[PDB]
């Protein structure tokens, strides 16, 4: 049995009603219950059962879940979402063997443009002893995701050397975080004077520099 | 409490096979299906088979039958899948999951993440990343841990053994050009408790049996 889930991403914001869909390839319901199961899985975590039998909320999880359907068709829906819910949600059967599960939707929740806060970090005097020097600049508690990160060295833009992350979602506050990491070896790293994390977001109106002379 | 603690992820060869554990306590091991279950990375969710932990009977999905190998210590009240043959396509989080009546899946391990690889498993090193005048905002102060240099995923950190956790980023790897991750954990805090309050990460690495706590202390 094949699970088709769509859409395949559902962006909404807090406080509204969200529906997402799970079709299966043939009917996997009696004439009195149905055997589709819905998951939650957050980031790093494993999923984590929702709804029971297409309707039955699972001890222990919120209201605001509910789910229906029969046959083939089947629906699950937050009535007033809550920025926690960020998260992919998966169905999956138990009419026949083996069991099969959807291939997920991803709930991303809406919310305000917030500017990133900036900070910026020496390499530690230990990690120096060992030869490499890691200059990390973080962006935090920004939205939407667009960021862009340059690096200057003595003002020079660096062309290499660095590597950024982002992190999903805040389940608390839906932003997102950033690092970049600028990496020297600690002979490259002393030639300069001044290292400066140079940070474009659409909640600033101009660029916003954090930066810190070489000692 | 219902609790599946699974084994630690672990690095495995070409070829070779790797055999996974997972501990059950708080019901009677006996009365539920242990599944387990397939999750590559970025991609969804595959059953691999069940066994029943009263007998050892099992049931595969015909996908892994020749992959893998379920069975039970009771008195431990463990259950083991063993793959076999491992594969690049093999490289995933494996779950275990109990199921009362082969339907839902009502309780989930924490996954373990095999990757198959032919480099040789590395443990971090851990850099403190201070707090100082460059790393203050608005009444806040930033502070973490850089993990550098590790193989293969994952690092886990907490800081001051899980009881901060408001605040705390822990970055998404990434892959350096040497072929080993780094990553980065921060947390914001009140400046004005500097002084006063403690933060320590504590960096978990199991592939390489690598633990380490470090104090991050004011530049």
């Known amino acids: 049995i094949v699970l088709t889930q769509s859409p395949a991403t559902l962006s909404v914001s807090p406080g509204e009603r969200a529906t997402i869909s799970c079709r299966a390839s043939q009917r996997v319901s009696s004439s009195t219950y149905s055997y589709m199961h819905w998951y939650q899985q957050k980031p790093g975590q494993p999923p984590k059962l929702l709804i029971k039998?297409?309707?039955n909320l699972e001890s222990g999880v919120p209201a605001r879940f509910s789910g229906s359907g029969s046959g083939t068709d089947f629906t699950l829906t937050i009535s007033s979402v809550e920025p926690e819910d960020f998260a992919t949600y998966y169905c999956?059967?138990?009419?026949?063997?083996?069991?099969?599960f959807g291939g997920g939707t991803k709930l991303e929740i809406k919310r305000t443009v917030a500017a990133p806060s900036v900070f910026i970090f020496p390499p530690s005097d230990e990690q120096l002893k060992s030869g490499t020097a890691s200059v990390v600049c973080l962006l935090n508690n920004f939205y939407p995701r667009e960021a862009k990160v340059q690096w200057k060295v003595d003002n020079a833009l660096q062309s290499g050397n660095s590597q950024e992350s982002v992190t999903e979602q805040d389940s608390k506050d839906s932003t997102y975080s950033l690092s970049s990491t600028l990496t020297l070896s600690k002979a490259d790293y002393e030639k300069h004077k001044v290292y400066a994390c140079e940070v474009t977001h659409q909640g600033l109106s101009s660029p916003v520099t954090k930066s810190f002379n070489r000692g | 409490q219902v609790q599946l603690v699974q084994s630690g992820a672990e690095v495995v060869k070409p070829g070779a096979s790797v055999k996974l554990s997972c501990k059950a306590s708080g019901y009677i091991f006996t009365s539920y299906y242990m599944y387990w279950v397939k999750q590559a990375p970025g991609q969804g969710l595959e059953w691999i088979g069940e066994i029943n932990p009263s007998n050892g009977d099992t049931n595969f999905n015909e996908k892994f039958k020749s992959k893998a190998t379920l069975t039970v210590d009771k008195s431990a009240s463990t259950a083991y899948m063993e793959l076999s043959s491992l594969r690049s396509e093999d490289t995933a989080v494996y779950y275990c999951?109990?199921?009362?009546?082969?339907?839902?899946?009502?309780?989930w391990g924490q996954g373990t993440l095999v990757t198959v690889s032919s480099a040789s498993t590395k443990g971090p090193s851990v850099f403190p990343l201070a707090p100082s005048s460059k790393s203050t905002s608005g009444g806040t102060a930033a502070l973490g841990c850089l993990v550098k240099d590790y193989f293969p995923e994952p690092v886990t950190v907490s800081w001051n053994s899980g009881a901060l956790t408001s605040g705390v980023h822990t970055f998404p790897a990434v892959l350096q050009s040497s072929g080993l991750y780094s990553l980065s954990s921060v947390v914001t805090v009140p400046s004005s408790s500097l002084g006063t309050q403690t933060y320590i990460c504590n960096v978990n690495h199991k592939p390489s049996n690598t633990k380490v706590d470090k104090k991050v202390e004011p530049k």
């Open positions: 999951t109990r199921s009362d009546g082969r339907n839902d899946m009502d309780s």
């Open positions: 039998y297409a309707s």
């Open positions: 999956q059967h138990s009419w026949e063997x083996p069991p099969t």
